[PDB]
């Protein structure tokens, strides 16, 4: 295994949280975005005309993605194509963290570059609740 991520803002949920890095550098600061559509990242975001590319001078985008329906590596690949700088997969149930693994089936696996991590449903819901309230959610990854 378990690593760390730091929600730097807002104050309501800021702090250090456990996470499990995907089984597939330096410090990285980004801003969290929960997409309106395609929340499980099983289809291409360009089908929805959704991009996570950051405008010049602004924080890179960490996309929050729900667990389910497709492989974790496809989620990371689809988010990477949409321009995300990292992917956080919120677990679909409240349980201990698991290590996202390669599909084994039975590339693009050698072409996945963005950092990947699975977080708890509790932290996933807390992040979504802060974004729904109108606050930006910033985060620091030191892996």
């Amino acid at each position: 295994e378990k690593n760390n991520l730091k929600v730097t803002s807002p104050d309501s949920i800021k702090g250090i949280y456990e996470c499990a890095i995907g089984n597939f550098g330096g410090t990285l600061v980004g801003t969290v975005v929960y997409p309106k559509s395609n929340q499980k990242a099983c289809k291409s975001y360009s089908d929805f005309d959704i991009s996570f590319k950051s405008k010049p001078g602004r924080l890179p985008t960490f996309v929050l993605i729900d667990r389910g329906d497709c492989y974790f590596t496809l989620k990371a690949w689809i988010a990477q194509q949409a321009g995300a700088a990292a992917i956080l997969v919120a677990d679909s149930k409240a349980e201990p963290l698991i290590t996202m693994d390669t599909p084994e089936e039975d590339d693009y696996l050698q072409n996945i570059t963005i950092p990947s991590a699975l977080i708890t449903k509790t932290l996933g819901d807390s992040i979504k609740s802060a974004l729904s309230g109108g606050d930006m959610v910033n985060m620091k990854l030191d892996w």
Binding site: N23, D69, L97, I98, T99, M100, D101, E104
Partner: peptide
């Protein structure tokens, strides 16, 4: 605990 999906 390890899983692919």
């Amino acid at each position: 605990r390890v899983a692919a999906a």
